[PDB]
Design a protein around this ligand. Structure first.
Ligand code: CA
Ligand code: CL
Ligand code: CL
Ligand code: CL
Length: 305
């Protein structure tokens, strides 16, 4: 909402920088696994600088400043930067307690920051705005976005909800809340064409996407949200004697992709990343084929409703 001129960006990097200072303290004993906030933030500044030089060398600092996605973006960075600053300040020594709510928030902000990097890289590839040129991966999902939002690259949660409701009935405010949590990756109360793309790749097919999303991310014991490759394997160890035990996760380095971990007949733990097939189909097929039987070790897979 505040123009994105250099004056306004640097106030944003100061705060970002501030977050790096707080986080680079080795006392934190930050676990070395993605998302690596200390890599993400600088990487984020590097891309913001790359952008500025594209619109300086082209003398279009004007447009950039008045681009709505970009204005929202850097305002978001400020918001989250200030939020983490506040987290260390109010959190005090909780920030050195791994199993602390405040440290969970830190992990959540790091996730958010990582998503914002993937998003900005996607709509400003090589430093140039391509938001209006972002081709969505799933055809039926692409049809929806362009029909209701044309070439817009970002749109408020309120309107994304109202428009989605026209094609996919959103039963109540509570379901909306939950759906927002899933799709609003960057946690800025807007839905970007990138976020939509990720969401629709994950919960395809479009035609029953809320049903799919409910089955997969709301009611499914197997759904681990974001976890590392190692956390999935470690969490499955205890079911080694139970072939067909499985969980699935999102990857923060490969947004829009799923990873399934399961226990083989000979007690081994493998991982698989679906490429051609959508997760929803992969799970159902695999349950019938005898590989995906016990989600997070539970006795039965969930019903489809
Ligand atoms: Ca968002
Ligand atoms: Cl298209
Ligand atoms: Cl826009
Ligand atoms: Cl689809």
């Amino acid at each position: 909402q505040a123009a994105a001129d250099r004056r306004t960006v640097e106030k944003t990097w100061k705060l970002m920088d501030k977050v790096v200072r707080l986080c680079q303290n080795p006392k934190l004993q930050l676990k070395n696994s993605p998302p690596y906030i200390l890599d993400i933030l600088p990487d984020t500044y590097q891309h913001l600088r790359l952008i500025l030089s594209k619109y300086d060398d082209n003398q279009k600092l004007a447009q950039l400043s008045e681009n709505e996605y970009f204005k929202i973006y850097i305002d978001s960075l400020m918001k989250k930067s200030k939020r983490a600053i506040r987290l260390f300040k109010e959190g005090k020594e909780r920030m050195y307690e791994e199993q602390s709510q405040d440290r969970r928030n830190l992990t959540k902000l790091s996730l958010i920051f990582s998503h914002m990097l993937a998003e900005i890289k996607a709509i400003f590839p090589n430093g140039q705005f391509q938001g209006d040129n972002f081709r969505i991966t799933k055809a039926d999902a692409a049809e929806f976005w362009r029909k209701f939002f044309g070439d817009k690259t970002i749109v408020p949660w309120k309107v994304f909800r109202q428009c989605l409701h026209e094609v996919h009935q959103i039963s109540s405010g509570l379901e909306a809340m939950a759906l927002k949590s899933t799709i609003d990756l960057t946690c800025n109360d807007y839905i970007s064409v990138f976020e939509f793309d990720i969401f629709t790749r994950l919960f395809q097919p479009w035609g029953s996407i809320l049903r799919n999303w409910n089955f997969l991310a709301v009611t499914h014991p197997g759904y681990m949200a974001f976890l590392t490759y190692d956390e999935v394997k470690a969490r499955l160890q205890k079911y080694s004697t139970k072939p067909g035990s499985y969980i699935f996760r999102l990857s923060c380095t490969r947004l829009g992709q799923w990873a399934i971990g399961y226990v083989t007949g000979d007690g081994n733990i493998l991982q698989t990343i679906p490429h051609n097939k959508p997760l929803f189909q992969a799970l159902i097929d695999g349950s019938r084929e005898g590989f995906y039987l016990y989600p997070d070790g539970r006795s039965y897979n969930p019903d489809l409703t």
